[PDB]
Structures are given as C-alpha cells and as structure tokens.
Amino acid sequence: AQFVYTMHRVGKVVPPKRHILKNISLSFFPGAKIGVLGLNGAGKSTLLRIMAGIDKDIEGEARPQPDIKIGYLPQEPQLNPEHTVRESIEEAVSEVVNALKRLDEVYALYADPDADFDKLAAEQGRLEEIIQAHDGHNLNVQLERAADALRLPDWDAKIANLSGGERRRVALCRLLLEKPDMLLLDQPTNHLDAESVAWLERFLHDFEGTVVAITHDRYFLDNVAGWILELDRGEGIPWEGNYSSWLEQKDQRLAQEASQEAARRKSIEKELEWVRQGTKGRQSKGKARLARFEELNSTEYQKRNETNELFIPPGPRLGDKVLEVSNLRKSYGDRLLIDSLSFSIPKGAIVGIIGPNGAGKSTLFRMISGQEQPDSGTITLGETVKLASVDQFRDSMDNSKTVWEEVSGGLDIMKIGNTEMPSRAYVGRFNFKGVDQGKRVGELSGGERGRLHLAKLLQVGGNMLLLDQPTNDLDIETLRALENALLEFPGCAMVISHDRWFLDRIATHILDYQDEGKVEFFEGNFTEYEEYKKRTLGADALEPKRIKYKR
RNA sequence: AAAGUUACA
RNA sequence: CCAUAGGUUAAUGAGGCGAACCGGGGGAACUGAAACAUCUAAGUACCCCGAGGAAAAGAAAUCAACCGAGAUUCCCCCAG
RNA sequence: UUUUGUAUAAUGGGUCAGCGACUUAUAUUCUGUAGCAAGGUUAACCGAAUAGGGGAGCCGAAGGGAAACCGAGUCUUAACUGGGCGUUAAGUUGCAGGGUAUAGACCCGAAACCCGGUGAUCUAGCCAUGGGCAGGUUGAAGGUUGGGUAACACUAACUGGAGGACCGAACCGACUAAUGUUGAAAAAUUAGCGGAUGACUUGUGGCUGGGGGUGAAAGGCCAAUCAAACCGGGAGAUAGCUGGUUCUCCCCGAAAGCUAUUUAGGUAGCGCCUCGUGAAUUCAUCUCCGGGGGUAGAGCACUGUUUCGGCAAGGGGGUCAUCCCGACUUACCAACCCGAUGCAAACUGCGAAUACCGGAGAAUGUUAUCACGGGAGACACACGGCGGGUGCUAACGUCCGUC
RNA sequence: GUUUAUUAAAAACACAGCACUGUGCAAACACGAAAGUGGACGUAUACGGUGUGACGCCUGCCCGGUGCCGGGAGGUUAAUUGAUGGGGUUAGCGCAAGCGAAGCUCUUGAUCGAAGCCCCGGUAAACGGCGGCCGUAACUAUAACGGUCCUAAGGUAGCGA
RNA sequence: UUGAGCCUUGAUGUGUAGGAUAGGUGGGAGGCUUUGAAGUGUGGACGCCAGUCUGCAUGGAGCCGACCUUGAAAUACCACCCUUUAAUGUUUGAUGUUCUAACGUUGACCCGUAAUCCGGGUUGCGGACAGUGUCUGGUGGGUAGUUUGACUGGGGCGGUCUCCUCCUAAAGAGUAACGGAGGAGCACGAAGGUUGGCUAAUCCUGGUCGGACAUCAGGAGGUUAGUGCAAUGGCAUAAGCCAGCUUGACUGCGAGCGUGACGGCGCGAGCAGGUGCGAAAGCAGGUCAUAGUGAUCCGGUGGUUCUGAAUGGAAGGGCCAUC
RNA sequence: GGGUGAUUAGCUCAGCUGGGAGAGCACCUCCCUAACAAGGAGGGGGUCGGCGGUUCGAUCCCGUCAUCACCCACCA
C-alpha cells in the first residue's frame, strides 16, 4: 500500500522558540479519512498549510506522491468582492474557458490567411488537448450541475452581497471543481447549515481520495473521519475510534500527565531540601547528585486551555421594554426574507435565531442595529437599551496591530460603562494571560481571532447583545466558557448560530426562519419547541436528496 | 437521613 | 549367510631435546596523549603449534596510463 | 645542598681505597673550518674493496597563489593610484662544535599495572584414616517394686547413668600483671587465667591457587610477606618530585616580572643575561624649547555630608463645627535662600613639584641604542626608604608602585 | 562455642529458634569457554539465599519513592524488510541549449517488528518512612478538647537523661 | 480460521429535461428470447424510494432501438475499462491444531563389555518446541578501565573564574589583594543615513471640573533635563526632540597608526564600483563612546567546472558567503 | 562564626517576570431554638515585615536590614 502523503520528523518553530509541531512522523494512505483535533492554537492550520505545500520553512521532510492533486481549503477562504457568483466560480475551470476563448480567437485564421498554418494551427492541437483533458465543451452543464448540487446562489449575484454560508459554499464548489485526490479542509463546516453540512459529510464519506479535515465539532467528525490526530501541545497523537472514546483517552492522558508533573514537583522539592543542607564533615556531598538535580529542573508545557474566563461585562440596568418588532418585512429584488414578522423580547432572554443560509438572520441584526431600513418599519428598543453587536465576519480588525493594541486601542485604562478597567487585565480576561498580548492580529489563529473579536466587541458594555455566529472557530472549551458567560448575563442577548446543541443549552426564545420568508417566533427553549412541533406535527421524515458531483 | 445539652428550693 | 563397530597379530613411521632466525594460533599492560576512554605502546612482551638449513613468498584475475613494464625476496631512494 | 635567608639546633657524609652520573644511533637548524662553486654531492651497489666507477636521487640557482595557472612576477579585485608575498645579497658536501627531534637519553629512586609460572611442609577450610582426654562430682530420661486409679494420671524407694553438665591434670588456648624490648625468644618467660566427652584435640596423607582460594567474618589467613602471595619477564614502567652531578684559568653577567595555562613548586611567548653580525650626533646625562595632565595641596560652584545664625514654607501632638474654609499652640524634626565654618578614594568653578612625550644644542660615555641570528637561565623573592590598599594609623603580616 | 598468628576476645561472629523468598528435579544455585561436577545418590517435613537471633509478651500505620511480583489493553521501541522520493552515469531526442529509456549505483527511508520503559494492580520480618503552627478547663501551670496547613502515613505497644 | 494483493465471474452507476435509475467513449446495425415467453403468483438484495436486478412455477414468440423536441443515447455482446461491491481460484502473511522425520532425552532394554563413562541399535516420551551460532533491543557495580578543576593569608566549606565603568593607581600608559562600589551575555529595519526644523529640569502667577503635581498662558531659571540599559567621559554646531525622503546596518581595498607575548582587537583619510539624502558645499562603510561574547577541529547550507587517482563525468576536497 | 529559608486577614495558610486580594475558621447582623450548640441567610478585615532600587506594575522582580526557623562549625 503506497502512501499518498508522508511526513518525517516534521517540525515547525513560531516566533520566539515554540515548537508547535515537534517530530511529527506520519503517512497518509489512499482512501483515508483523518480528523485533526486540538485546542485553539495547537497548530492544526499550520500542519495543513505544510501539507498543502504553502509552508516549506518547516524542519523535517513533508511531501506528497507525484501527480496527485491536493485541494486545500483554508479556514479563511478569500474571494474577489468585485466578482459575481460566476465571476468567482469559473476560476476553478479557468483553463477550459481560457482555451475556449483562444479557440474563438484562432478561428479567424481560416477567414484571413495571415500566418496560416505553421505558426498557430499546430498549437490549436495543444488547445484542443487541454480541452480534451476535461470535458471542456460540456462545461455549462458541469457548472449547472455543481450549482444545483451545492445549492449555490444564481450566477448573477455578486460576492460581497452574499451570506457567509453561501460564501463558504462558493469556496467549497470552487475547490471541488478542481477534482483533486487529497482534500485538506480547515473547518469545512464553519458557516454551513444543517442540510449543507449533511450533504458535505455524505460527499466526504463517498470521496475516493484522501481526506484530512480540521473540525472542532464531534458529530460531523464521527460521520466523516476514519481516525483522529489529536495534535496536542507539540506532539501529534493518532487514534482509532470515535469522538467519545478519543475523549476518554484524552482525559486519561491528561490525568497521567498531571500526576507525573505532581510527582516531578515532589521530587524536585525533596532534592532541593537535600541541596540546601551542609556538607557535615569533610565528606562527599557529591556532584553527581547536583548534576541530576540541575537536569531535573526542567520546563513543562501547560495547556493553554481557555476554560471559564470569557468576560461579558454587565451593561446598564434594563427595563421591561427591550425590543419590539411589528409586521416586519424585508425583500431584496424579487426574493423576500422576512414577511409580516412581529415579536417582543422580554428582558433577560436569550434568543436563539436559527434557519437556513441567507434566510435573513444577519439582515435582522442589521435592522436591529440600525444599519438597514425595513420596508414595513416598526423596530423599536427601550430607552434603557444599549446595543453591543458582534458580526458574522471578523474583517474589521487591523492585522498589523498587536492583540493588546487592537482590543484596547493603546489606552492603559479601559472604560467599560461605569467602571474603568486596566486594559491588560481585561485582555487577559480573554485567555491572553501572558506575553500573548504581544501577538499580532494577523498572526493569530482562527479561534484566537474569534476570542479577540469577542473581547474587542463586548467592551462597549451594552445590555442587549447581538451575537452573529459567535462560536465559529471556537473549540468545545471556549464554547462552554462562552455558554457559561452568556448564562451569567443580567441583560438580554440574541444569538445567531448553527450549533443546535450550543443554542439549546442557552436559548430561552426560539426565532426560527422558514420558507416563503416567514420567521416563526416561539417563546421557550428547544425542548419545548420540539414538543410543540410534535404536538402539532406533520407526517414525514426525509429532508435530503444527495444529488451528485460526477457526470 | 441528621436530632447534642440545659446547677435547684 | 548380511554388513559395520570392535578385537588380535604383523610390518612401517613419530614421540623427546636443542641458542638464534622462520611460518602460524592467541595476545597484554605499564607508557605517551603533560588527566583519560577513541588513539598510542603494539600485533610488541608473553603463551602455544609447526618446521628448515634457512623459512616464508613466488610466476599477475599485478601495476601503469592510451606509452608501456613484466614471478617472489632483499638493499638505497621516492619521503617523513 | 636547598633557600628570601643557614654557624644554624634544616639536609647529607664515621674514615680511607676503588667504582659512580650529559653518552651513542640517526635526522634537522646554526657556527667555525676545508674543498668545489651556479653548482655541490652521491646512496645502495660493483670493485685487485679507504682508490676507481655508480648522479638513482638530494639540496641550490624563482616566486606568487588553496588551486588551475602565471612567472621576475604573482595573488587579491570588475580594476587597482593600491596592498601582501617575491625580484635588486651563493650554494653545497665533508669535518668539529652549540641546540632540537626520536630513541632509557645526565645518573640513582617509587607505590603500582600486565603476562607466564612456583607455592596449602606455615596457616583457612574440607576429605580419608587412627590416636588422646589423670582423678573426682551431679544425677536426666527410662526401668523395677510398693502405694494408688475403673484404667490411667500421680507418688515413694531402689535403680539407671544423660549432658556442646560441674571441679580439676595431660592436652588445647591466651584474660591480667611484671619482666624482656641491641630479648634466652623477629611475641617468649614467670605468677595467676579459660575450655578440658566435645561446635573437642591431635598424627599421617590428600584437595582448593592469586582478583583466586579459604574465612563461626578480623579484611582474617594463604611459608616470619596480604585491601590482592611469591618468582621470572614487559622493564632501564613512568616520576612536572627529591637527591647527586667529578680538572683549571679568563670575559660578561641575570631573574624571581607580564601574559596564558586542568595553571599556581611545571611550562610557553615576551622582559632581563650572553655570543655573533649589521646599522643611524641611534642612546644616556644636563640646558633651552614645545606639550598633555587633575596627583599633593587647596576649595566648596557641582555630587554628598556638616555645625551655627537670619529669614523662614512645610511638617507633628492640643484650644474648636474632634467634616468645610483648617482658627488658634513648637522649651520645634526639618531640606529649601543668605552669612559664617568644616570634611571627601570613588566631589572639582582650582592646581604644583616631579615624572613622561617630542625637538635643538654642546661636553662626556671602551655603541652605552636598535635590529637579526645561536645559547640560556629565570617566572618561590627578601628587607630598607618613599606613595598607598588591607590589618588594630598590629606583625620580621599581606598586596601593589618606585628606588 | 568463634575471632583480628604478632597491641583489640568483646556488647563483635556463630548459635538453636523465627520469618521472608527462590526451587517440581536435567531443581534453584555454584565452579566450569565446554564436557561435566557439587547441590544429592537428596525430592518441598528437601535444598539455596537473605534478615533476625534462646525463652516470655509482642511485633502498630504508610506501597508515595527504590526494588520485586502479576497484567496485558494502549503508546514508544532493535536487528530485519526495503516501498517511496531525490541524485550520479548515459543509449538516444536534440549535433547551438537542455531533457532523458534500460541498466548499474549513492542516498532517503513507507510497511513488519519482541522484551523493556511509560501504564494498571499488588508487596514493607522488601530497601525504607512514620508532621507542623495556633487556641483552649475554677491560677495560664499544662491542655483531655478545638481550628487549620501538609503527607503515602504522620511513631502504636513498650521503653526513655 | 483468517488478513492483503492479483485474475476471472457476477452485481452494480435516481441529477434537470425525456417515455424512465441515462457511467464513459463505442461501433455497428436491429437483435434479444423462443436453449421457452412482453407477464401473474412468489423469495432475497440494492434502494438518491422512483424503483431495476434477482431464485422459482404453468403458461413459452413479444419486450427496447430505429422516431427525436434533452448537453449524451437506448444493458443490443466480448472489450482492455472506470466507480463501488460479492463469490470460486491464485499467491502470499498471521494465528492456531494435528503429525514425525530433523533435534532432545540426566526413561527402559540390548551389544561393544568381565564398564551406572562413551558409542551404536530397538523402543517410549517430547518435538519442529527446546537448545546452540550470528545479529539485535533491554538489564547488568557481577567485573574492568578511569574521571571526580583551580584560586584560596593551610585544606575542606563559602565565594569566585569571561567582558564593561569608577576608585585604589602615586597629574603619560600600565599597575595587585578573598580591596571598595556597580553593571553585561542585549536592543533597534528604526532607536541606522541624511536634509530641514527645535531646546530642557524645576519653580512662581492667572485659568472649568482640576488638586501637591494633567493640559493652557506668561515670568524666573539656564541643562540641575535628556541619552534604549551600569558608571565614566562627552554632547548646544547638540551626540538631546520632531518631520520628509530613504537603506552607506554598501562591495573590493586601504596610506598610516594605537594596543597586545602571540592569537587577536581597535581607529582610519584616501582609491575604485554602485547608492541615499541635500539646491549645493557636503555627510553616510551602523547606533554619543566605552560591555552585549567563544579559537580550532568536525560537520551542515548556498555559490564557484579551482581540483577531479586511466579518460569524460561524479563523489570527495579547496575557495567565497554563512550556520 | 558561616550559610539557607520564611514573613500575606484575628489564627492556619493559598496567591500569574503585573492586574482592590483569596480559602477554611474566627468576627458582625439576621433566621431557626424556651435558651444555647449545630444548621441556614446575608456582611465586613489587609504594614502583602520594613524607607530601598532596573519597572507600563512591583505581592510574587530589587541590595538590604528586623525577627524566627533551620543547617554547618571537619582534619585540629
């Protein structure tokens, strides 16, 4: 069984001397499915950037087999805002389109005999060969089939005027149109809804080539992965099994490491007590034991686990009238997202906003924050309400600035409502508890980017929160910390998310989008929402179709 | 399940 | 009945000793390195086996450089 | 002899006579001398063999560059106005001598390491075999006969003769003292002392052998030797350590410092010594001239420390609305400004004498100066004067500078 | 009883007794390149090693450390095997460049890979270990008692200048 | 019993539009089935739930193309086929059980032989285990060879060991002590280069929250400030502070010096080539200076046909830059 | 004589090359109770040993002294 990829002694060093990856020796075999786990900063995206060939700085040797295609989807897929849907899409088939245009230019040869045959007719064969390498002529059908299978927006739509989920779908389609042999995915379900994620995971299970996927979720991982690469601090640990068994193994590993560190502390204290005694005569003391103690005094890497410190500052006191919408309606062109929506938000409530992609979830936040003007108006907030909004996109932070400068603005004392707070203490409240204040925004990882985003955008101190997909790149630990912080909140919050479990653990009012632009509002949590649906239900259970890619 | 004590004419 | 091992009798040799030299089987350490462990001393001292008047080697599956020389051994250079 | 320094009460020598320590291979550099000279010279070897042949070679006349390569030039560099190394000075082979290298390498001297053998006639254990233990005590089990008991159990007397049992000779030891310590004796004698039928003692003969044995275990014993026997060899181990180093005269004449050191008592480069060669009013002294100081002394503008006055903010405890504006007390702690007065290695708005650096001028001085080359020794210093650190303004203390 | 022949005869060694442990016999163990011997012409009521040391009353708590015993799941892991990638050479395609078949080579090293170690239990007549500070009762004299920190556990019986 | 691979035989391929599950080109015409059907009843499998594939039963001659309005055409073969899958083979690999014939036997019997040695022969029992050889991981004071620094008011213990600043240090340099005080093992693509511009600390007076001290205004003062970090020396022409443009934090050299015992270290005008700033004169080969460090060996990386053990390459060397 | 460590609320102790400074029980009030204990609710405390120092911060960093706790004083 010839492998597909190999890494031997692969090591990476980041600023100062930090071995994110140390001695990672691995082989990737045909038909494999690997899920890469770890905390927010472990080095998963680093390892995939190495596997994509983008990073060659590493120590060791990492290489794929020759003439195998690696399709790399990062966790920051960039697209051309000028481009429309088709203008961004065809770049994945640009060879065929460019060659076809060249054929159109060449066809004037047989009209005008200028440099007739010995100069370009021979190259016409090379052009027809590059068409033949693909289907080429039946290309519009390929594009239509891909768009149908991935539920892409119509090609006339622009890219800036696109929802985050559909943006990720465009990136997925442009990646998979290349038709590679090894997929590298960096959180491929970042902004996807339930149907999109289910289709993607079925496709991944069907994929013939190798798949290496980074995921902070567990159910999609149980679906797709064949084995897990833990990727702890420094070292990568393979594992055969499911997420819960791997979790058990991980707790056992961390408990053993904690016990060994405690024993090390014990032995070091004992030997220090020995070192701090006198010679007692003209006898040994001994340099061998001194050397043993000096080498025993070493350094161990503590886990940079976020855990429960996510600091949501308390806003101003909130009256009973918080938010009210009456007959809200919004449409774009001919497709309408919200139609005759009315609801009131009692104080203290967490509102789980759910629905498919581009259904209007983010545009609702735009109206509430006042950046968009509804057709049917009647959005209102109580006079005590102070709004703090967290966007679906992090594209507002200066990647040059450091963490502390970007969060705090450079002022040593930070004002949060009534109380002045030390900026360094406030930043450290968001797990940047060391010299992590010095890291650059661009050099931060995706999960650290989300944490810094929350830190910068919760400082306004509003007692109404408008969080749009707040747990995008976060792992389970930061997710739990955020859930606890949201629970210990005096004000009220509206959270848009696609994590059903995270939304269920905190939501008190469900705002769910449906077809034909109806936004059903339900006061209650997800358990009683499901119970209400069961009480007044409809008889069927089959959502998907799982269309195809090939042919 | 827990439930101790509290000087006399 | 086999046959072999074994036994018996003959003839034929060799045993042991000896100074060095010679071929082989094993093979130190002190010392030097200003310590020492790679390294050196040194394949030396020593032990053992086997010859001979010498012994070993010896007649290219050797060198050399498109010219060539022609088995082995020893001496002087090459060259510290 | 060793030392800073010895009559030293530090070492060595009783004395005589004899012996006793810088040698010999090669190789290399320098000096003298001899021969030839841009040449000199052969080695092995042949040889009627100190000749004569033999020129294989070696050194020299050309260097530069890592090299290719170029060449009285070359290298560097894109190139050098450049710069480094060379060109404008004879070598070579003997002989004698001074060094160095390898050999024991000036002589003597370890404790040790390795190799091969000799030892269990001493002593450790064990094995086979066969001897020794005067004399006297105590009385175990068991047994018998009676009492007993249903039978036992038990009990008495008699018996019996156990025991790493008791006392004590031979025998085996070795606790105490004295003597003896160039002894009667390289461990004993004398007077006492312990065991003395046992894990005893003893004869003869065996067996275990050196990182091995044996050990009722002390590192004990293994031929008067044992934390690794003895004999022979490697072997003249090695010894930065000690000792010793032998005839005479003449000339010059040190150092005990710096730097480095697995280095401090060793060594290396430099300083200082000597010999040779070559060179300049080269060097030294004094006079004059041109310089830089930040020392002694002094001073208090600076950094600090100080006293005393005069102005005096502020600061600490009471008299009050023991919140405000503070409204009033210091026989005041107190730097800030001024007037006086001190102190300072790490203070300076000042500042010598000397010393040092350079120039000129004589006189004087066996060139005293510098460079190169051969040979060293020395790198433990001592005290005294002057300037100081340290110490106690101690030390024949210790550490620097200078004489 | 033994011991430092030759300054130590003792409280030292031994000892009967005790315990732990190994050992199923071609025993463990020891001497020995080996053969083979002892153990033993014995056979777990036997033999070896270790500690303690008649007898009497006893021998408390700690398995965290070191060792030993058991476990096998997972991790790390040797020699082996030599996939894969890279390079050297060159028949040719080019005779300007450069590429490069087959072979042969240099290197790199996928896959396979046991015991140990990590890990999980046990074991102290295995080697070993067996706490602080503060307050508190008719005098502060002391604390039966209490608070708290730490530990693997905090020294029990009995002895004690 | 399995694991893996390979060859066959099957089975399988729901987009939209389309008659309805359409893999790809085919390449061709009609074949299929009658060697018994286009079906009904029945059983399993797949099932993107439409459905097409299937073992059967009497009945056994009709299903699609061809026709085209779809990007494409009609399981209407064998294909070498792609995708998944399942079966018999095939190799191999693992584990297990049985066997005997290697091997063991310190079981019995027989012979050599008048011998509990040894050998041979029968037989029993184990048995490809055990055991040994080579290679290899672990353990291994059982044994062996060694190491285990120096200074030091004796040694040990404590402290120190390299570099920078001041004093000791005696007005040139240098100058010791286990003398007296402190620091370094870096920082900076600006905090470097230039060209312009600018001048502090502290105090007094007036001024909204606002005072002992924030920002403002004017007066004294005159560097008591500042310098990336110790101390010393220096700095107004600022070496201090601000801004524009920038990369001289250049490459090859280098008269001449200073300082070292040397290794080495430092300063440097000027020359050549290119550059930045400035209108120019000019300045710039790092930073106000003095700390911020490590010889050689060995090896790594890039460049250079300098070398290349017959020749052409190459390996390995050298040179340059660097780790 | 030399060396080391500790100092944090009333007590015993945790405390990030910074971030009012924390835990048990003590203390305060209120419930519960005839009344106390125990139990339950609320609450407050601080020289971070002290003058010192590179610092965006000194509790943890920064020489020192103050005290109590140790350790060593060997050949001699």
Ligand SMILES: Nc1ncnc2c1ncn2[C@@H]1O[C@H](COP(=O)(O)OP(=O)(O)OP(=O)(O)O)[C@@H](O)[C@H]1O
């Ligand atoms: N140049 C850099 N210098 C210093 N730290 C860096 C640099 N680049 C990245 N890092 C750090 O390396 C860490 C690893 O980041 P990385 O993106 O690999 O993590 P991740 O686990 O893959 O993230 P995520 O799951 O959130 O996408 C982060 O903490 C990041 O800040």
Ligand SMILES: Nc1ncnc2c1ncn2[C@@H]1O[C@H](COP(=O)(O)OP(=O)(O)OP(=O)(O)O)[C@@H](O)[C@H]1O
């Ligand atoms: N300016 C616009 N013109 C046209 N269409 C627009 C415009 N802005 C947004 N849309 C579209 O309208 C829909 C609204 O989507 P929106 O960004 O509000 O979030 P969502 O789709 O509800 O959520 P999510 O961000 O999670 O996908 C999307 O389909 C989006 O592409």
Ligand SMILES: [Mg+2]
């Ligand atoms: Mg040796």
Ligand SMILES: [Mg+2]
């Ligand atoms: Mg030596």
Ligand SMILES: [Mg+2]
């Ligand atoms: Mg030695």
Ligand SMILES: [Mg+2]
């Ligand atoms: Mg022959």
Ligand SMILES: [Mg+2]
């Ligand atoms: Mg006398």
Ligand SMILES: [Mg+2]
């Ligand atoms: Mg004398």
Ligand SMILES: [Mg+2]
């Ligand atoms: Mg001569």
Ligand SMILES: [Mg+2]
């Ligand atoms: Mg003998």
Ligand SMILES: [Mg+2]
């Ligand atoms: Mg007597």
Ligand SMILES: [Mg+2]
């Ligand atoms: Mg005898």
Ligand SMILES: [Mg+2]
């Ligand atoms: Mg011997």
Ligand SMILES: [Mg+2]
């Ligand atoms: Mg001898």
Ligand SMILES: [Mg+2]
């Ligand atoms: Mg020798």
Ligand SMILES: [Mg+2]
């Ligand atoms: Mg004289």
